[PDB]
Paper text:
In contrast to animals and yeasts, CME in plants depends on the TPLATE complex (TPC), an evolutionary ancient adaptor complex. In this study, we used a multidisciplinary approach to elucidate the structural and functional roles of the evolutionary conserved N-terminal Eps15 homology (EH) domains of the TPC subunit AtEH1/Pan1. AtEH/Pan1 and Pan1p proteins are both hallmarked by the presence of two EH domains at their N-terminus. In conclusion, our parallel structural and functional comparison of the EH domains of AtEH/Pan1 revealed two divergent EH domains with differential, yet complementary functions.
EH1.1 consists of two EF-hands connected by two short antiparallel β-sheets. Anomalous scattering supports a calcium ion bound in a pentagonal-bipyramidal geometry in the loop of the first EF-hand. No anomalous scattering signal was detected in the second EF-hand loop, but electron density consistent with the coordination of a sodium ion was present. With respect to EH1.1, the NMR and X-ray structures agree very well with a RMSD of 1 Å. The major difference between the two domains is at the interaction interface of the N- and C-terminal ends. The hydrophobic core of EH1.1 is shielded by the proline-rich C-terminal loop, while in EH1.2, the proline-rich N-terminal loop takes over this function. On the one hand, EH1.1 coordinates the PA molecules by three main regions (residues around K42, residues around K78, and residues located at the C-terminus around K97). The N-terminal double NPF peptide of SCAMP5 was identified as a significant interactor of EH1.1. Bio-Layer Interferometry (BLI) confirmed the interaction between EH1.1 and a peptide derived from the N-terminus of SCAMP5 with a binding affinity (Kd) of 59 µM via steady-state kinetics. Mutating the conserved tryptophan to alanine (W49A) in EH1.1, and testing its binding capacity by BLI confirmed its essential role. We conclude that the N-terminal double NPF motif of SCAMP5 interacts preferentially with EH1.1, mediated via a hydrophobic interaction with the conserved tryptophan residue.
Author numbering: 5 to 105
Amino acid sequence: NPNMDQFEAYFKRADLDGDGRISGAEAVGFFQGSGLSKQVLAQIWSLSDRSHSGFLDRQNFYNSLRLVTVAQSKRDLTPEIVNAALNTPAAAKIPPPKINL
Ligand SMILES: [Ca+2]
Ligand code: NA
């Protein structure tokens, strides 16, 4: 499957209970494979849980994956970078991240 959807594959791996949402605990466990600091992952979680419900839907989780890629590229998150990933078609250019599984 050379064109396999890696965002979807990560969503399915992260969603341990199959309820179609990524819970806080599921995100903590999944992103332990990201190589990022807990401070950065906290900021990504906050930015991604747009409804403040404690769960990420698919869109929210894919956006958290995009922010993880930017952080793995050693770019400092700025308000402009965050908005570019969350609210503009620049998001489509961001690869899925590398996650140790
Ligand atoms: Ca879940
Ligand atoms: Na939410």
